[PDB]
């Protein structure tokens, strides 16, 4: 068994180019390489499977839907928040936040993480001494 197929409606992360990180719905496949991606801010266009990383979410739509139908299907399947909250998209969100930390916030993160490290170290030593 495979867990993930290129099929109508499946949402895919775009993983290369100037549009890295967008979700796009594969609404139709051109041929064994190219498919149509429909997006809320991006108009339906073909893009190549080499540049798409398939995701875990499927939305249950028709082929080449009307844009309003696709948007309401994105709402009913809740792809934005599910993608954001799952670990894969949280990786991208956290990665862009670490991109957007400046010097002083980076310093406060350093402080908080030194104190976290000390706390974990002390707690681990205590529980390791409780372990016999």
């Amino acid at each position: 068994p495979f867990k993930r197929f290129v099929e109508i409606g499946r949402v895919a992360l775009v993983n290369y180019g100037k549009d890295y990180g967008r979700l796009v719905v594969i609404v139709d496949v051109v041929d064994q390489n190219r498919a149509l991606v429909d997006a809320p801010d991006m108009v339906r266009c073909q893009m190549n499977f080499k540049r798409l990383s398939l995701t875990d979410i499927k939305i249950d739509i028709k082929r080449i839907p009307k844009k309003a139908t696709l948007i309401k299907a994105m709402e009913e399947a809740d792809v934005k928040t599910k993608w954001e909250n799952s670990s894969w998209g949280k990786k991208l969100i956290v990665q862009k936040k670490r991109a957007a930390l400046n010097d002083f916030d980076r310093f406060k993160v350093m402080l908080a993480k030194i104190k976290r490290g000390g706390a974990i170290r002390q707690e681990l030593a205590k529980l390791k001494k409780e372990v016999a």
Binding site: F5, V6, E7, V29, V30, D31, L36, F49, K50, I64
Partner: protein, 177 residues
């Protein structure tokens, strides 16, 4: 974005002469990379078909044609005349693509690959949209099915931009389809 071909239509006629003071008018639909190449191809076809040369001809109009619905996939047919190494032949080619403009690119690439025929050797006799349920080629016909599903057998592992790529990486990548 950019397309390597553009379907122009070129309209031309012979120069005025004392008899036939309005020489008759010829229209053509030519693929090329730009204006000047489309024009130079137009005089080719009206000098090997209609006996008119650029010196003794005159070009009146050249338009660049565009496509109606760039957002939808359209099964395209191309009837094309080509030169092999030892003669000429006639091919029929069915493609699925969002534009005829992209189908022509795909078709030159296919003739340069399957037959080592270059562009200077290829003629597009007739182009048309051969809508579904009337396509002839199997590779076109096999994408005519909703409820289609297939996994990706071939997926390059590659960092999103050239910045994120380094030469050593600790973990062997996890590939799964």
């Amino acid at each position: 974005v950019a397309f390597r071909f553009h379907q122009y239509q070129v309209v031309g006629r012979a120069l005025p002469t004392p008899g036939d003071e309005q020489p008759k008018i010829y229209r053509m639909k030519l693929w090329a990379t730009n204006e000047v190449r489309a024009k130079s191809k137009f005089w080719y076809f009206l000098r090997k078909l209609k006996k008119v040369k650029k010196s003794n001809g005159q070009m009146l109009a050249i338009n660049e044609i565009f496509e109606k619905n760039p957002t939808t996939i359209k099964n395209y047919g191309i009837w094309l005349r080509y030169q092999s190494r030892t003669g000429y032949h006639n091919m029929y080619k069915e493609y699925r693509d969002t534009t005829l403009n992209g189908a022509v690119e795909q078709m030159y690439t296919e003739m340069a690959s399957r037959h080592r025929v270059r562009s200077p050797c290829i003629q597009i006799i007739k182009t048309a949209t051969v809508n579904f349920k009337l396509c002839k080629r199997d590779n076109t016909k096999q994408f005519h099915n909703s409820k289609i599903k297939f996994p990706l057998v071939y997926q390059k592992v590659r960092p999103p931009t050239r910045k994120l790529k380094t030469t050593y990486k600790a973990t062997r990548p996890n590939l799964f389809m």
